[PDB]
Design a protein around this nucleic acid. Structure first.
Ligand SMILES: Nc1ncnc2c1ncn2[C@@H]1O[C@H](CSCC[C@H](N)C(=O)O)[C@@H](O)[C@H]1O
Length: 452
RNA sequence: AAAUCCU
């Protein structure tokens, strides 16, 4: 019978989907941070529960051959790069395995093709967006990242997985906030002004948005602070402000203001251009998203007489990438600022067959089913939570030949696939694509197809 | 349960 602060020798024999090592000691399953399969360790017992436990590595007796000894990545492991300690080919194997394991555990599929995960040539310096808290650490305003399961800011200049320019811009903005004596936010004391900095930068265009996320509308000498950052970085076309007065883990509140220039950046994906608002979603890994889409598009086998639904449209990138190669494109997007981009993105690219509606995807499908639209293909790309039961049920009743499901969470996709199978759709292909190198997150594309 | 970390 184990208990807190005991040290025991264990072999790690698996990984959780989130990246934590698994060892099984005396009826307990232990989740050990920074422990890879086959590693011998002395495990410190942190917490004992009924069926599970939690552990810390006290000593490595034997490490993995697949361990990455990079000391620079180890600082990030407890946070933004939670799989950095595993070598890249094995990360890919791990992610492929996770997709297979989820389709079985959740949906009872063992017989379907799951191609190996498509990885990056150079899996670094990829993210086009960065969200960076601003905090006081030892009486000094610092940008960085939060330690896992915490709000303790780890000071950091080199983010490893982000666009190097974004790191330069965030370091510049940190130094400017220090010089202008603008107070960082304190969560516990509920005092200060500057909560987070959000910096999006177009993968091809290089055009930069800077969102200053603050506790109150009034920012003291912000016009001068912008004036200086534009001289360092001429590529800033937009400086936005966001007010968030709540005590919440959520980044933005309701109010968005434009402090300078445009209220959008412009970037390329596949052939076309796309305007992108601050509150709108843009795929963080443009390089691999283009691949993610090109897989989905090839899976969909598009004819000129097809009628596509692009559910969870965003700024319209999937729908508009295919609109010139088909009859009609209908899309739905809940966030007004994104679906307004989507409308302009259609006009920019000369696409007059791209019709959009601002609503929940659940509701848009219900109206489109009543209104008598005849969709042949359905592309879906929901957030982690996945799809609603009512959306799956409605989409089945449209009699759509193919459904292509893009996902950033295989757990919810496996569930939702399970329900598509109960309504006469069959899972044909699956291709995982590594949008998030050095992290536990798997992106996926699954082709469902109907039976007569 | 909103988003790479952001209980
Ligand atoms: N119930 C709902 N109905 C429609 N859209 C929703 C929704 N819940 C969240 N969303 C939206 O779904 C989108 C998911 S991500 C959008 C992906 C887009 N195709 C792109 O690659 O750019 C977000 O834009 C989000 O605002």
């Amino acid at each position: 019978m184990l208990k807190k602060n005991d040290i025991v020798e264990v072999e790690i024999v698996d990984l959780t989907h989130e990246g934590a090592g698994v060892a099984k000691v005396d009826g307990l399953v232990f989740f050990v941070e920074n422990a890879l399969p086959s590693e011998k360790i002395l495990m410190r017992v942190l917490k004992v529960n009924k069926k599970i436990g939690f552990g810390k590595v006290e000593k490595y007796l034997v490490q993995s051959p697949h361990r990455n000894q990079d000391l620079d990545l180890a600082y990030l492991r407890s946070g933004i790069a939670d799989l950095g300690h595993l070598s890249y080919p094995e990360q890919l194997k791990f992610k492929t395995k996770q997709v297979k394991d989820s389709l079985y555990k959740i949906a009872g599929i063992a017989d379907v093709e799951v191609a190996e995960t498509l990885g990056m040539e150079h899996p670094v310096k990829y993210r086009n967006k960065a969200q960076v808290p601003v905090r006081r650490v030892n009486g000094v305003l610092e940008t960085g990242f939060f330690r896992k399961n915490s709000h303790n800011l780890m000071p950091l200049e080199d983010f490893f997985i982000q666009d190097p320019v974004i790191d330069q811009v965030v370091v510049a903005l940190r130094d400017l906030l220090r010089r202008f004596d603008l107070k960082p936010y304190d969560e516990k004391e509920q005092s200060g002004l500057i909560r987070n900095l959000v910096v999006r930068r177009g993968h091809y265009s290089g055009q930069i948005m800077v969102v200053l996320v603050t506790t109150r509308p009034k920012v003291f000498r912000v016009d001068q602070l912008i004036e200086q950052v534009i001289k360092q970085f001429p590529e800033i076309v937009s400086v936005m402000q966001n007010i968030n007065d709540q005590n919440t883990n959520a980044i933005f509140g309701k109010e968005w203001r434009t402090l300078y220039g445009q209220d959008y950046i412009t970037d390329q994906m596949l052939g076309n251009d796309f305007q992108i608002a601050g509150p709108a979603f843009y795929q963080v890994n443009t390089e691999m998203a283009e691949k993610l889409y090109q897989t989905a598009i090839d899976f969909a086998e598009l004819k000129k007489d097809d009628v596509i639904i692009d559910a969870y449209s965003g700024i319209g990138t999937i729908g508009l990438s295919v609109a010139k190669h088909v009859k009609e494109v209908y899309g739905v997007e809940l966030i007004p600022e994104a679906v307004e981009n989507s409308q302009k993105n259609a006009s920019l690219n000369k696409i007059t067959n791209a019709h959009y509606v601002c609503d929940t995807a659940e509701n848009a499908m219900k109206k489109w089913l009543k209104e008598g639209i005849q969709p042949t293909v359905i592309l879906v790309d929901p957030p982690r939570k996945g799809l609603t039961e009512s959306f799956i049920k409605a989409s089945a009743q449209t009699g759509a030949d193919r459904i292509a499901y893009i996902s950033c969470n295989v757990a919810t996709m496996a569930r939702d696939i399970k329900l598509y199978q109960e309504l006469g759709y069959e899972l044909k292909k699956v291709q995982p694509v590594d949008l998030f190198p050095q992290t536990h997150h798997v992106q996926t594309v699954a082709l469902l197809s109907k039976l007569d």
